[PDB]
Design a protein around this nucleic acid. Sequence first.
RNA 1: AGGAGUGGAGCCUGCGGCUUAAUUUGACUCAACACGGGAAACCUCACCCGGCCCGGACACGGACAGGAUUGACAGAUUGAU
Lengths: 95, 73, 120, 72, 54
Amino acid sequence: MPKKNRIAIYELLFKEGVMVAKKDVHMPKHPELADKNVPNLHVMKAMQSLKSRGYVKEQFAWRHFYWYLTNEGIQYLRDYLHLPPEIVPATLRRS
Amino acid sequence: DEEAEAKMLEKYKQERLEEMFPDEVDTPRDVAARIRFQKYRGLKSFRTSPWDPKENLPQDYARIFQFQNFTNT
Amino acid sequence: FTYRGVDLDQLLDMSYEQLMQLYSARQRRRLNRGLRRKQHSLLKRLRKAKKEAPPMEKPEVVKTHLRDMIILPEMVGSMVGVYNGKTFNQVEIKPEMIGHYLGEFSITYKPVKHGRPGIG
Amino acid sequence: KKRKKKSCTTPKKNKHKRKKVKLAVLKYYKVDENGKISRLRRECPSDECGAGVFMASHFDRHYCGKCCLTYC
Amino acid sequence: HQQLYWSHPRKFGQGSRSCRVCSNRHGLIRKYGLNMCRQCFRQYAKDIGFIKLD
RNA sequence: AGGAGUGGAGCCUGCGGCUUAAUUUGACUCAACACGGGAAACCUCACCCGGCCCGGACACGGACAGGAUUGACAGAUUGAU
Ligand SMILES: [Zn+2]
Ligand SMILES: [Zn+2]
């Protein structure tokens, strides 16, 4: 997968901390990441790479994939995309 | 001297292909099976099968001496 | 030789939308819905085998999977080989089979000769 | 034990290798000591790969790598 | 292998529909928009609200 | 005690046998045999003949920006841009 795919999958992971999928290899493009043309196979195999390291936490369902973010996975996105900690994701917004 | 040592180290091994595998050979991939193992046969029971003891005498067995009954002679 | 009252020589230059009015309804509807992208490239292969063939010699056998190819009258004389699931079987196109499918000339099965019945 | 090695692996279905000469820009460029830029091969007139991305020059044609444009 | 593998037209037919929880293709209940297997419907029937009255 | 029958006939569909490159398969008294919601053109599809792909996470060593895989017109090769 190219850089504008593997980067752009990691961008919305830091935004809210969760990612869903379909377990649909053959899907043309992921519906959350329109205007990028990233297939569902790309985000599926990217999170398969991230789960074995321990940055995300997997849960399955009827058909869909679910992924949360661990504490040591926030820092792995913090340095891969170079963000300062003065901004926060959706952890400390309400209450 | 080392080529026989190359025969020696494999004889510590080709012997040891016999004490864990009885006669595990590789089947021939190139030549047909009715050609590589033409000469053999399959026995229904290794002890209670018939076998003609003089079916294929080699030419060396025309150079040895026989007995009519060894114990009684 | 003719076919619906017109000889093969007018069929060689019979146009695309006028030859369709001589066929039966499956083949007429098939020419109405169009010949697809991998069926234009077969006729081009048979042209490429025809005009490089020697003038006293039939062209070489050509291998296909296209069992749905209608035998057009511009496809007579060619040696096509249509598959049977196992082998490519050699087919020589005669002018009397110009409304059939290509896939009814490689039989797909061994015609059955029975043995002795076992325990029924 | 409880297996046979069987020596029956046949992967001999050879793939390609990317033959690159050492710094193929020297195949691309040729500069004399006065400073002339002699682009020995054609430049593709496409919108995506114009003025920087060079074509191929085969035995009978020009050939691109981005949009695979072809000439005679 | 781009105009290929997921190329074949799956626009109808038995193998363009699958169960929505099994992803299995056989014994399928398309009525009322259920789209479940006949086995996975029977597990989740009382959750959907299909009660067995008679 | 009866009624409709089935078993006879043609055909439709299951199941054995034979055949086959393959004729995928489970189930064999009631408690297998229009059952697997099983009415398969492709898909379903397991089976047969041929071919492409990795969709082999991650950890370690090498190749390593005198590069690692990738993609691609034409020609031959091919069922096949
Ligand atoms: Zn370009
Ligand atoms: Zn289901």
